[model samples]
Target: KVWREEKERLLKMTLEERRKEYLRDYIPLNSILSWKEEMSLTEKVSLYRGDITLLEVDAIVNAANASLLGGGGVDGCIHRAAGPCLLAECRNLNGCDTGHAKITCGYDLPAKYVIHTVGPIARGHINGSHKEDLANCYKSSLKLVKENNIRSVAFPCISTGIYGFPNEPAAVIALNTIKEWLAKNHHEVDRIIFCVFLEVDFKIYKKKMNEFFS
Candidate 1:
């Protein structure tokens, strides 16, 4: 309720206002594995409570709509921070399909590149097959990481917001998929940061992190 209202309020503000607000909370990704000869998967993975658009990682995942233009939540915030050219570039991509991803230069945002993935909308009920679609949202973007030589990538909680995918289910899929991928493909990226705006989401990732990786 409060988040919905605050989000609507934020949307009403000029892009400049929201841009400034995001930067105000910006924190660059921290590295602690430099000294470790071989860092564990837990060391390679991380959690952050901040605006994903403000991240200075190699890339930040934008949980975008099929249009790849922009919509609510992380999508709008990312497009706003990255500037109008972001939209112009997305216009060129034609669009993205749910479970698929496309990449573009980040423009004015702190992150150098943006990887946009369209997540499944579970308004009615999500079947098992569609569940992989959500996992593919992560898988597709992770593939781009290797191709782009992206050292680090931050992922938002895809499909959990307005898309209406149940929070715990989505989080579990995210946890399992990312862990599975990293176990085999961790070398593709130096760090994988899970970024969240809501404190409750931070907790979800937090609990899963300890249970799944720690």
Candidate 2:
């Protein structure tokens, strides 16, 4: 009841007042992972705790199933937010293969495009191929982003939900793969956000970020 009332009270404020109140308690530092290169601009890789659908980035990656029709988890949320038209377009493409990605118009979504990638289902014991497949998911999505000339993109923690990929290990793969891809691309993209929904997953990503960069 307390949390519900607080949210209700927040909703009563004007947009400016709401923004001010939201920022009042917000900590804005250390969520970034910067890359320094010779004769090139640095890119910012950051972590954000929120809903990916509300972001106005150039594109947002969806952890979609091979069916591409959308079932549950992040995929379903993206489909619903993008409205019925999204599913209609996806149907024409047939489906996606594990580790491969495809793109489509975002329709009603705040993002301009949605890059859908099918992640490997994590078993009780993840194998080497699982890691490789997960890496391909990020690599392929970024490739599509560049091919389309997009400046910014956001990614969810792929395979970590109903697919059963362990949070910490998945974080390691996600950060490492994206970091490597961004390095080779030479700042082709402006911002890459690892947008996570769960607090526990956010903590894991933060821990992995510190370990990977430090």
Candidate 3:
């Protein structure tokens, strides 16, 4: 009886409230080292001290919208870096579906291939099935990497900026989804790097990954 009531109470809470609660748990003190060591191929997370503006990754996940045309944030930055040829390539492929991904030449960008992934916006729990959509974004990107035999990849925090998905919860979801994907196919990719911009985001990712490994 108590368990049922607790579950019902949780179900009634708004996603915004839930997200706020999620953020409360994102402290750096929660960082767990052993959890990552056991589950990760790299064993230790690499802390890159430079911007993601130019990376030598085999592929980079673009935090793109479903259209794949262009938008603000990382999507706009990547397209700009890749130049007009990248847009022309996307035009060639047409549009990508939500929860599905499309690939294109990075053109002038440092990475060889750009994995365009559409992430979900936070429309509150009542209207937006944000969690499922966010999960799909990671799964879709990794699946494409496996199919193409790409060995190394870098990912930005999808949907956390401009798109309005709260940062901490989204970080948790991203790390969780990636870890789950890596478990079954450890040999598929050699490295997965999180190219985060803000200190808060970097800290959040570390905390979530630690908690995951723990």
Candidate 4:
């Protein structure tokens, strides 16, 4: 009875408000985080320095390897936290293609779903196709979020880790792609979080966000 009444009260808030509340619990006391402009009345863009697996949002983006069975970095951490069920579910995914994304149950993670996307392997190629492929990672993930009726989703620095994509350009592509998508779409999503585990990446995204939104 108590849970039901509290759930109803929370449901009454706007999606963005609810996301802020959910994120607040896991954000550390001394974490360096900041907000960009409210992207839209129903949407907000934020830069957070924390572990993405702890965010209590509708979905969290996984910077997955092609296999999606979980490799090193963020993928490994998410899989470890989510337990073996996440791996078993991912096994049936048949592997995700680069620049493409797919969805699966979050299993033991706090998020309800995990949107896994394969970021391109940089390999010193920052040309047109490379840029587009990186952009597609964000676009594809958002598409899945809309398809699944997810209101809030958090993203990691895709391709910037072992994939070797340069953080500055990758951050630009991520924020610009998301902004353009929100401008054109029907606006089902309410919050998009750039969840950075590295303080350096957090600063990069935060600077790009301010410049882009300003």
lDDT of each: 0.80, 0.77, 0.69, 0.78
Residues 75-148 of candidate 2 have per-residue lDDT tens digits of 88888887777788788789999999998877556566899999999767789999899999999999999998
Model 1 misplaced stretches (Cα beyond 4 Å):
1-26, 31-39
> Against the hidden reference, what TM-scores do the models get?
0.83, 0.79, 0.76, 0.81
Top TM-score: which candidate number?
1
lDDT by residue (tens digit), candidate 1, 127-154: 8866989999999999999898888899
List clash counts for every candidate, in order: 0, 0, 1, 0
Ranking by TM-score: 1, 4, 2, 3
Stretches > 4 Å off in candidate 3? 1-50, 125-128
CA lDDT of 166 in candidate 3?
88
Q: How many residue pairs of model 4 clash at the backbone?
A: 0
- Over the full model, what C-alpha lDDT does candidate 1 score relative to the true structure? 0.80
- Model 4 poorest 10 in a row by lDDT: 27-36
Judged by whole-model lDDT over C-alpha atoms, candidate 3 comes out at 0.69
Q: Model 3 has how many clashing residue pairs?
A: 1
Q: Write the per-residue lDDT of candidate 3 for residues 95-157, one digit (tens) a residue.
A: 887677887755555455789988887756413478888888899998888987877677898
Runs with alpha carbons beyond 4 Å of true place in candidate 4: 1-43
